[PDB]
């Protein structure tokens, strides 16, 4: 199957914002170098039936009247090395129009989005795609530099230039920056033992170029009834109550690390992001559209994470967000700003998880309707290079049977160790949970 | 306008790779005659001094990339080159100005102002060996900048080139290390089988002529022309082509035969001469198991179409399309395996694709804009090497600088008597007069 780039379309603001540049300063959590990477995904609409390349190239146009700094460039500063980003009048967001001879049916895939490296990325910081299906429907790809923001922030832009595509007179929130006044360090940097426990110094350790070969990326589907058994099971063994993503991360936490053969002493790492924004004293705004997420974690030594009962490891995985506070983010921050040159790391080990089935995937409604499936096909991720995404539930698991729903976990996971990994979700799908 | 040299600097790596000297097999593919080129390739910038930042970068860069300080040399046992590299080995940097505005000339993109061969070194055969990377910093007088560069193909491919340059333009951005370690290893990863076997794709192409010069022939001098297609233009041809055939052909398919035609009809090819269109395609991710993300060394195969002239210029551009597309079916990684096992039963007896060979390369969505030191991405790009594909006539799709204003660039290489019909074809194809069938 042929993918055929038509042409690529640089997609300037509708009214040029800017009268000469303007360098915005980006925040201690946008400068994280767990985020100098371009995050990739896509979203697949139905019916292609003007065009959605026409729609969504004209509401990039309209959006970007007020969100012009995704046109920018991310450079160094002259002082710290740190990112910035510069906005010039002329600059673009690259819309890439593409068509493929196939079906939806939602190696090729990776050709949907454009695939810059950490640097390359930089230059181009957002790039979208509008793949055209022959047998009907179409792809939207996005490829973003993780310093400019968060999936909170993207989904805001995103439903910007959805509103506008629906016949939006003005977009309904206007996107706030002040990024240095909302989130930068204090007077007299301090730093609490919930970061100082996580975090470490390395300047020689690269968290995305560590040597475990090559990572494949596979997907599972996770039965409603499954979890409902397992989620059972515990509270029967222990008494105490787990949600799915404690128990089913627990599962495959425990999974991947007997799975790598890791060694019993090494510390190893369950790592999650979680929305501050309205957890600051004063909170971030709605329209701040920056990265505000931070880490979190629980940590054990492997070989405890692999022979102790699941139900001490979802304990676990649910205590770390006691650590959530305005405090910790403030510690969080203080310690980029002491040790960003220093390799601020949360070490080898590390296995992030991102949770995307509570999310407004829906809204970003061009005309097509909402997404009937949404893919992360970028590997690197929460300073792991192995992260698993459990994916929305599709339309079809509310119209099907109860013993038929269920959700899409993707997982990145060193070649060697996916045969075993397999074997463990078999036996989780047969319900053969080996719970101590 | 008059290009001066200032000056020449000779790039050694920040620090020094080698202490011991080495010996670096090349690949089959990189040992292909048709690879015994120089090519020459051009980058404009519009605006420390470029020449300071382009240096400081290249001298980073090589300490991943030394072998194109290294010198190509035939080995001992057959004629094949591999790359000898040790401490004090160098790139050169020629450093020059030319004392006129790139806004007075088309930033380059409009016809030669007199100088354009002077913007990138033109060496020798064994210049291009003992030097199989120079690079060229000219400085026009206004402040902007063109990047020139020369490199032996037989050291790597366009994706190669592009890793290389990438990493030194991230360096001079200010990385704190390159993104894509480069990988050598071409000896295990492309060498050919113990009991080497070629399939019939491979061998229906190829022919074996010890005699034979792709690069010499004797055609009279060839001319490089430009032209701008729209976008609309190439949408009415597709619209058309799908109209009276019922296939979709994709740009390069459908412009690829337009061209192909109107230039063996303007060459006057005889009418039972074979004539071929090539191309080349990464093979990269094709393989089994693929080759690593950095492998810098060649790693395209060329594919071809072949028809007799006759029947080119006659047929309906469908059909012509059609022999394109149905082209890429012989893509595979036995193809692959093919070629390479023919170069090693046959490098000395002449392997080539004949006579009536017409390259074509789509450099439309290469990654031109990353390429930025900090002055941006290139203004303009062209390649000047003609040599190519085992044709002395190649053609290149490149990036251009409304709707209705809409569409990319055509290079053509072609020689001087079939130019001015070549005009006429390409008049006619922008006023929508395809004559299709
Ligand atoms: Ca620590
Ligand atoms: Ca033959």
Redesign the pocket.
């Known amino acids: 199957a042929t993918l055929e780039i038509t042409d690529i379309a640089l997609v300037q603001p509708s009214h040029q914002p800017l009268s000469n540049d303007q360098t915005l300063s980006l925040s201690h959590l946008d400068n994280d170098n767990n985020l100098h990477v371009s995050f990739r995904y896509l979203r697949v609409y139905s019916s292609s039936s003007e065009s959605p390349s026409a729609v969504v190239s004209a509401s990039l146009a309209t959006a970007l009247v007020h969100y012009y700094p995704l046109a920018g460039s991310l450079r160094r500063s002259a002082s710290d090395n740190r990112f910035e980003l510069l906005c010039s009048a002329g600059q673009s967001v690259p819309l890439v129009n593409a068509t493929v001879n196939c079906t939806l049916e939602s190696g090729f895939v990776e050709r949907l989005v454009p695939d810059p490296t950490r640097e390359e990325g930089m230059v181009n910081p957002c790039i979208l795609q509008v793949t055209m299906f022959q047998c009907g429907g179409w792809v939207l790809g996005a490829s973003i530099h993780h310093a400019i923001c968060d999936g909170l922030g993207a989904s805001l832009f995103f439903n910007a230039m959805a509103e506008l595509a629906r016949g939006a007179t003005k977009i309904s929130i206007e996107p706030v920056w002040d990024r240095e006044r909302l989130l930068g360090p204090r007077e007299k940097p301090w730093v609490g033992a919930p ?7 390395d300047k020689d350790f690269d968290p995305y170029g560590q040597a475990i070969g090559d990572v494949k990326r596979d997907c599972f589907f996770v039965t409603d009834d499954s979890l409902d058994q397992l989620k059972a099971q515990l509270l029967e063994k222990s008494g105490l109550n787990f949600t799915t993503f404690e128990a089913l991360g627990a599962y495959i936490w425990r999974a991947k690390v007997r799975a790598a053969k890791t060694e019993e002493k090494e510390n190893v790492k369950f790592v999650y992001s979680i929305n501050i924004r309205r957890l600051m004293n004063p909170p971030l705004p709605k329209g701040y559209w920056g990265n505000g997420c931070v880490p979190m974690y629980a940590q054990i030594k492997a070989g405890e994470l692999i022979e102790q009962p699941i139900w001490k490891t979802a304990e676990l995985i649910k205590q770390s967000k006691s650590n959530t506070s305005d405090e910790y983010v403030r510690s969080f921050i203080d310690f980029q700003e002491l040790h960003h040159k220093d390799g601020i790391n949360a070490g080898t080990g590390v296995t992030g998880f991102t949770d995307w089935r509570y999310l407004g995937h829906s809204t970003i409604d061009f005309g097509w309707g909402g997404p009937v499936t949404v893919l992360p096909l970028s590997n690197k991720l929460l300073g792991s290079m192995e992260p698993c995404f459990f994916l929305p539930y599709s339309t079809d698991a509310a119209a099907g049977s109860k013993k038929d729903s269920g959700f899409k976990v993707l997982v990145n996971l060193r070649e060697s160790a996916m045969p075993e990994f397999k074997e463990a979700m078999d036996k989780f799908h047969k319900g053969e949970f080996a719970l101590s």
Not at 195 to 201: E, G, H, N, P, T
């Open positions: 970061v100082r426990d996580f975090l470490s110094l």
